[PDB]
Write a protein that binds this ligand. Structure first.
Ligand SMILES: CC(=O)N[C@H]1[C@H]([C@H](O)[C@H](O)CO)O[C@@](O)(C(=O)O)C[C@@H]1O
Ligand SMILES: [Ca+2]
Ligand SMILES: [Ca+2]
Length: 183
């Protein structure tokens, strides 16, 4: 494989560390499809954004790939007051106590798949699936979704071993094998 963006070896134990990838948005802003593969260790059980790409200074205008105590999912929201929507695809899963590996796969005209620890944990069949191209972005973060001020930013605590972003779907086979390294 070959990523358009590669982040790794990150420790996020408090609010301020906390990885600002805003300066990289031009790489992701036009993606209608793609894949995110990330290896991580969570410390809390609340909804935590592993990666949040968001507008503003807005409340509900964001992409969020999140993990929970018992869930994995993503949101793509808008906001703006014209063509507004709230997408939410998630799955009940059981994580390793320690290190976990997930992948979100988006394929334009097909839909979405979520992988975790070498299993396909969710299939979304949607020929009209949307991705980053569908919202305006002015903020990017690994470890939270940047939101207005009174809205929950899904603060992550723990470590991120790696975070690879691709501009193409990427085979199920590869994704099963990479995430499967933490089966
Ligand atoms: C992944 C998920 O379910 N997100 C939802 C969150 C969480 O349930 C709470 O923030 C948990 O405290 O709640 C909302 O009201 C919000 O904050 O915008 C709606 C949003 O879709
Ligand atoms: Ca853990
Ligand atoms: Ca903020």
């Amino acid at each position: 494989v070959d990523e358009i963006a590669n982040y790794g070896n990150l420790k996020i134990t408090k609010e301020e560390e906390r990885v600002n990838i805003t300066g990289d948005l031009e790489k992701f802003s036009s993606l209608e499809e793609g894949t995110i593969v990330t290896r991580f260790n969570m410390n809390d059980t609340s909804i935590q954004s592993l990666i949040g790409l968001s507008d503003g200074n807005k409340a509900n205008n964001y992409f969020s790939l999140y993990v929970s105590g018992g869930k994995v999912g993503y949101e793509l929201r808008r906001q703006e007051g014209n063509g507004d929507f709230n997408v939410h695809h998630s799955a009940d899963v059981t994580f390793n106590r320690g290190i976990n590996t997930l992948a979100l796969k988006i394929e334009k005209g097909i839909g979405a798949k979520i992988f975790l620890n070498g299993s396909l944990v969710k299939t979304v069949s949607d020929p009209n699936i949307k991705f980053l191209n569908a919202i305006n972005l002015n903020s990017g973060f690994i470890g939270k979704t940047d939101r207005a001020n009174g809205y929950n930013e899904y603060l992550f605590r723990g470590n991120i071993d790696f975070m690879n972003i691709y501009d193409k779907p990427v085979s199920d086979n590869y994704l099963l094998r990479k995430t499967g390294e933490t089966k």
